[PDB]
Amino acid sequence: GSYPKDKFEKINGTWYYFDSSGYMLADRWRKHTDGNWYWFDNSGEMATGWKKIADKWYYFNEEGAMKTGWVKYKDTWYYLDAKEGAMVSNAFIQSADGTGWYYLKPDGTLADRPEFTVEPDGLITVK
Amino acid sequence: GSYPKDKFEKINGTWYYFDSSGYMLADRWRKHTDGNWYWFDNSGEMATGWKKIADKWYYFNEEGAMKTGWVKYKDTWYYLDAKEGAMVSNAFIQSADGTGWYYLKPDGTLADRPEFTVEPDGLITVK
Numbered sequence A, B: 001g002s003y004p005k006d007k008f009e010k011i012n013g014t015w016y017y018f019d020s021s022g023y024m025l026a027d028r029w030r031k032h033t034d035g036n037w038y039w040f041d042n043s044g045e046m047a048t049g050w051k052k053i054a055d056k057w058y059y060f061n062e063e064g065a066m067k068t069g070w071v072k073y074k075d076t077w078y079y080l081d082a083k084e085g086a087m088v089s090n091a092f093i094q095s096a097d098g099t100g101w102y103y104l105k106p107d108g109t110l111a112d113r114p115e116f117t118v119e120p121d122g123l124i125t126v127k
């Protein structure tokens, strides 16, 4: 009624989330009742789009839900850890059919045309 | 001690282990006070070298201690998971100097001469 508690609330046209004492969360994560994780920056505003928390990138949809799995941002694929959420970079992510792998460049972007180089001991270098 | 209670035992040549309850260990793992993981087959014999436990491969030093990381067996390189100790297969383990990767074949052997096929979308197939 007069004391928002553990809930979302759109104040002044901005989404915030109040703890059990009526304070807005700030620089904190909150797993909502819908199953999604949400993040609120220093001003307490619900994160939308890309945000870098504790030196790891995460992608939230327009509704504020942190996404996981493959997503396409500006027509270029990315991969967010299926469990933790963070953007995977410089890694090979197994395809769904388990047939192959996809390589995400050092900057998280997918390599549609990866170039490999092999050294006599087998060390594979990608580019 | 009038009866062995939880400890090793070098019965002439071979080592064995009895639980606190007195009984001997067989077909059971045991993380000791040395941090090292140990295993004893159905005849309580302390594993040494290579062993296929529950359909997975592991390697212990000449002292029953389970080791992890790269290990060689007859001109062939294998990688042992640093957490489970199990043999990794059809996986890319990153080099220690971060410059590149080593691909292990499904059969668990290192691919020193890997061959790659990059599909239109960027899918990568390894041989």
Ligand SMILES: CCCCCCCCCC[N+](C)(C)[O-]
Residues within 6 Å of the ligand: A029, A030, A031, A032, A037, A066, A083, A084, A085
């Ligand atoms: C419901 C909030 C409980 C706070 C603990 C948040 C721990 C960080 C884990 C969240 N996450 C995996 C998405 O990064």
Ligand SMILES: CCCCCCCCCC[N+](C)(C)[O-]
Residues within 6 Å of the ligand: A008, A015, A033, A034, A063, A064, A065
């Ligand atoms: C009793 C209310 C049940 C809570 C459901 C609240 C709707 C989800 C919040 C929408 N959102 C902040 C994510 O945009």
Ligand SMILES: C[N+](C)(C)CCO
Residues within 6 Å of the ligand: A050, A057
């Ligand atoms: C580097 N990122 C792609 C994560 C930021 C886009 O604004």
Ligand SMILES: C[N+](C)(C)CCO
Residues within 6 Å of the ligand: A121, B070, B077, B102, B110
């Ligand atoms: C796979 N190798 C054994 C060649 C690399 C460890 O140095």
Ligand SMILES: C[N+](C)(C)CCO
Residues within 6 Å of the ligand: B008, B015, B063, B064, B065
């Ligand atoms: C042979 N032992 C395993 C008992 C010695 C290792 O410290």
Ligand SMILES: C[N+](C)(C)CCO
Residues within 6 Å of the ligand: B029, B037, B083, B084, B085, B086
């Ligand atoms: C397979 N082990 C039990 C040895 C690993 C536990 O982390």
Ligand SMILES: C[N+](C)(C)CCO
Residues within 6 Å of the ligand: A070, A077, B121, B122
């Ligand atoms: C699996 N993906 C759809 C992300 C790759 C095709 O570009």
